[PDB]
Amino acid sequence: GGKTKISFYSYFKDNQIGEVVKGFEKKNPDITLDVQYGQDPAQYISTLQTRLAGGKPPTIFNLTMDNRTDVMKSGAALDISGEDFLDGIDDTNFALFQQDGKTYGMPVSAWVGAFFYNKDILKKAGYDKFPKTWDEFIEMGKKINSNGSTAFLEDFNTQIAGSFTGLLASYYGEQGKSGDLDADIWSGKSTFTKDWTPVFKRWEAAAKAGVIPQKSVGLSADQVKQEFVSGNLGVMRSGPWDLPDLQKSDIDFGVAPFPAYSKEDGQWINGGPDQGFAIASRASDKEKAAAKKFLAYLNSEEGLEAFTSAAGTLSLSSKYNAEPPAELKDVVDNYFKQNKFYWVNWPKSPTVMSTEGIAQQQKIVQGQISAKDAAKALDAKWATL
């Protein structure tokens, strides 16, 4: 077999995955890895699709939230079900990289998001601890707004609202669901009208209470952050990416999971896999073997440390975990490590569906449509994909 040449068409830039590549090459002298780097996500998915269709598909590539089902449906990804290099990563992490019960990709890292709160604003409203349930969150918000302060603002412009997603995650998680929480909808066993309506109702109730305010529509993430840092804002949705700015600020802040839909222990955080890694089904035997060694390295202590530290993400594998920043210890240890994180990762036309969801959430906040109308619009849109 001698040396084996393989290729990797990477979604990740060199500043995120280059140390992994370097380490792998150093430790596998029999494998020559040729890496090409995507320029941006749109360009990545179209260029990868072309390369997978051509005469020389990349041996290793990424399943992203925008191409995962298109690639899997094509047959271009190798079935890696049962491979030993998957060990250490909880099974719920593979749902987004499965088709027909077979595993076609492996995530090793994740992002998270949660509620960041101004302890002083909360204390003034009589709270020494963050609300556990959404109803308590609404009651807390009303009190904060009473004091000329603003309870909560959120960026509704660029994505489905993180607070809504957290509430949705709880709605499902309280029923015993895990992994791909919206799977009843994806599989046609349920609908947005059945399952999202009740969540929209509770989310709408916070809007009607003034806690999700109309002045929040049109705000960017940066504008929300500016209000928080200025001491004007009780609560914002954010994530580890904002910690440096929050620590620099004058704010005594804490970090809490999203309030539960109904149960005292029903809290979830936002989060999801930072893409998946896949091997080409159209590759030589030796190439496949070498690619499996690369996936194994990625899911190793050395690989995981290198990747998560460069990318600023969290490990999904028990072979490595970083010590979280103190402020994030609860959210990491009691939610992320307990698989209580979720994001709506649509399996079809994710841009189309996010756009519709953004439009509907804004109309709910503005009192223009009911919860059931918003859910019916999502069903109507989904039924056309």
DSSP per-residue letters across 121-183: HHHHTT-SS--SBHHHHHHHHHHHHHTTSEEE----SSSS-HHHHHHHHHHHHTTT--SSTTH
Query: Could you count the other beta carbons within 10 Å of the beta carbon of residue 82?
Result: 8
The verdict on 348 and 305 lying in the same domain is no
Using a 10 angstrom Cβ sphere, with 0-12 exposed, 13-18 middle and 19 or more buried, the burial of residue 332 is buried
Cα separation, 335 vs 112, whole angstroms: 10
Backbone φ and ψ of 151, nearest 5°: -70, -45
Local structure of residue 260 (DSSP, 8 states): B
Q: Where does the chain have alpha helices with state H?
A: 14-27, 41-53, 68-74, 119-124, 134-146, 162-173, 183-186, 192-195, 197-208, 221-229, 243-248, 285-298, 301-311, 329-331, 350-365, 371-382
Query: Could you count the other beta carbons within 10 Å of the beta carbon of residue 317?
Result: 23
Q: Given the DSSP bridges, would you call strands 4-10 and 60-63 parallel, antiparallel or unpaired? A: parallel
Q: How many domains does the chain have?
A: 2
The verdict on 289 and 369 lying in the same domain is no
Query: Residue 99: beta bridge partners?
Result: 102
CATH code for the domain in which residue 312 is found: 3.40.190.10
The verdict on 307 and 357 lying in the same domain is no
The verdict on 266 and 286 lying in the same domain is no
The verdict on 253 and 385 lying in the same domain is yes
Cα separation, 354 vs 193, whole angstroms: 17
Query: Could you count the other beta carbons within 10 Å of the beta carbon of residue 42?
Result: 11
Cα separation, 7 vs 49, whole angstroms: 15
Pick from 300, 322, 344: which residue ends a domain? 322
Backbone φ and ψ of 16, nearest 5°: -100, -40
CA distances from 264 to 7, 260, 366 (A): 50, 7, 29
The verdict on 211 and 122 lying in the same domain is yes
The verdict on 290 and 370 lying in the same domain is no
The verdict on 122 and 93 lying in the same domain is no
Exp. method: X-ray
CA angle, 324 as apex, 107 and 255 as ends, to 5°? 105
Host domain of residue 144: 108-273+323-385
Within 13 Å and on the Cβ side, how many CA atoms surround 226? Answer: 6
The verdict on 233 and 98 lying in the same domain is no
The verdict on 265 and 171 lying in the same domain is yes
The verdict on 224 and 114 lying in the same domain is yes
CA neighbor of 117 nearest in space, from 147, 140, 148: 140
The verdict on 153 and 53 lying in the same domain is no
